[PDB]
Ligand SMILES: C=C1CN=c2nc(N)[nH]c(=O)c2=N1
Ligand SMILES: C=C1CN=c2nc(N)[nH]c(=O)c2=N1
Ligand SMILES: Nc1ccc(C(=O)O)cc1
């Protein structure tokens with residue numbers, strides 16, 4: 152199987168790798184259209200970041216950013232994912248009939264589970280060692296993190312299914328980078344063992360490594376020179392059977408996947 | 416095993432990807448020093464190109480370009496390879512005591528074999544469908560090219576060994592891109608089957624794909640946007656056990672190899 156590409160379109164001011172570049176509505180639409188041209192299957196819209204240096208974005212402001220971009224992309228028939236962890240914003244996305252809701256908190260509020268069940272959109276259920284809120288910088292034990300993540304998925308999937316969410320709507324994301332720990336060994340272990348998530352839960356898995364900190368620690372590179380380590384980790388994940396890849400440089404990943412497919 | 420990196424330093428005017436950038440002596444030395452900083456094990460110096468659009472460079476001019484660069488790099492203890500197919504230039508490299516002579520013609524002139532035997536430098540024996548001269552654009556049958564290449568290596572190795580060249584000095588390069596054919600299928604087959612060269616001859620193999628045309632035909636990219644397809648093919652070759660990789664972007668390849676090593 153070939154991994155599907157989520158194209159990151161950050162409509163923020165403080166995204167760790169491209170904050171402020173696509174804050175304007177038309178520039179965000181133009182960026183999304185370019186990523187689709189580059190081979191993106193889904194456009195992941197994020198009007199609020201979640202890196203350790205992020206600043207809280209209000210719900211009204213977040214919906215204001217997403218509203219005209221969703222409208223323009225839905226007009227073109229583009230599959231839309233929204234990277235939001237705020238239940239009121241997620242409820243707005245259900246009304247807009249987007250294809251995915253991408254929650255770094257993994258839908259931890261059962262009060263809205265009945266509303267999620269009535270929708271038909273797919274749910275990207277992400278695990279993090281923080282569980283609630285944006286990423287932080289904390290050292291973790293890789294084996295213990297993988298074990299707790301496996302238990303977290305099992306309980307959260309069961310809670311959503313018990314509330315009426317169809318199981319096949321759930322896509323699992325183990326988290327990566329600071330969502331797993333400040334030491335890169337935890338991210339490395341998850342990258343090596345994520346097929347065990349597909350096997351245990353029989354659900355698709357998304358891998359999101361693009362430009363993240365742990366790549367820079369292994370190679371000694373800042374965020375602007377992280378294309379090569381990103382591509383190395385993304386094609387490792389593709390070769391290992393990742394169902395979705397969430398990336399910034401869609402064109403480079405697509406070209407790299409075309410070469411890997413021709414050689415494999 | 417980890418592939419060794421040959422850093423390309425073109426002291427030419429018409430190299431297909433970076434011609435004219437490092438024609439100046441000090442700029443070529445500065446580029447070579449940067450590539451060593453980026454992780455290059457060997458610096459491959461080429462004062463004359465061999466792409467299909469190349470222009471013949473005189474022997475006197477070629478030696479004039481290489482002479483001060485070799486001197487500066489030898490002062491720093493840098494391992495030097497010289498990409499030259501002219502016997503008089505190769506004789507100059509033997510006098511300079513460089514570590515490698517990289518011949519796209521695979522040393523086809525037995526008149527100089529006795530001189531090659533007395534030297535201690537390693538010999539990069541490259542195969543091409545043209546055999547003599549620079550690359551051309553010609554469509555070829557992949558299976559027939561691989562078969563003829565295997566026979567070419569067998570006869571050329573035996574001729575060099577019979578003349579006194581120690582067998583362990585020979586590094587095999589199957590050729591790539593236009594050296595194999597204008598259709599990318601021939602390059603793809605050689606990339607998939609080059610371990611058979613190591614097995615049959617018990618010699619090291621060099622893979623040189625960086626920015627070459629066949630990558631652009633598979634992905635639909637010009638020479639300036641070929642980093643991602645280059646990295647995809649280079650780490651495929653590394654994972655398959657290539658002993659040497661000849662590349663332009665040493666820093667990107669090194670960073671990519673560090674990630675692949677940490678994940679493998
Ligand atoms: C930087 C971020 C923001 N949103 C994400 N969303 C998902 N699903 N996975 C990530 O790793 C992730 N990284
Ligand atoms: C573009 C070039 C010039 N010199 C080379 N040298 C070797 N050994 N192999 C190549 O593929 C090669 N490509
Ligand atoms: N949202 C996130 C953005 C970046 C990182 C990281 O660099 O590890 C983690 C989370």
Ligand SMILES: Nc1ccc(C(=O)O)cc1
Pocket residue numbers: 431464465466467550591592593594626627628629
């Ligand atoms: N010397 C060479 C340079 C480039 C190519 C190629 O693009 O195929 C082939 C030979």
Ligand SMILES: [Cl-]
Pocket residue numbers: 168169172399
């Ligand atoms: Cl960007």
Ligand SMILES: [Cl-]
Pocket residue numbers: 242245263265266267
């Ligand atoms: Cl709701």
Ligand SMILES: [Cl-]
Pocket residue numbers: 288289290
């Ligand atoms: Cl800590």
Ligand SMILES: [Cl-]
Pocket residue numbers: 306307310
């Ligand atoms: Cl739960």
Ligand SMILES: [Cl-]
Pocket residue numbers: 371372373376
């Ligand atoms: Cl850097």
Ligand SMILES: [Cl-]
Pocket residue numbers: 432433436663
């Ligand atoms: Cl360059």
Ligand SMILES: [Cl-]
Pocket residue numbers: 506509527529530531
């Ligand atoms: Cl000689």
Ligand SMILES: [Cl-]
Pocket residue numbers: 552553554
């Ligand atoms: Cl032809």
Ligand SMILES: [Cl-]
Pocket residue numbers: 570571574
């Ligand atoms: Cl011969």
Ligand SMILES: [Cl-]
Pocket residue numbers: 635636637640
């Ligand atoms: Cl292009």
Ligand SMILES: [Mg+2]
Pocket residue numbers: 161166197199200201234
């Ligand atoms: Mg974001």
Ligand SMILES: [Mg+2]
Pocket residue numbers: 425430461463464465498
């Ligand atoms: Mg050259």
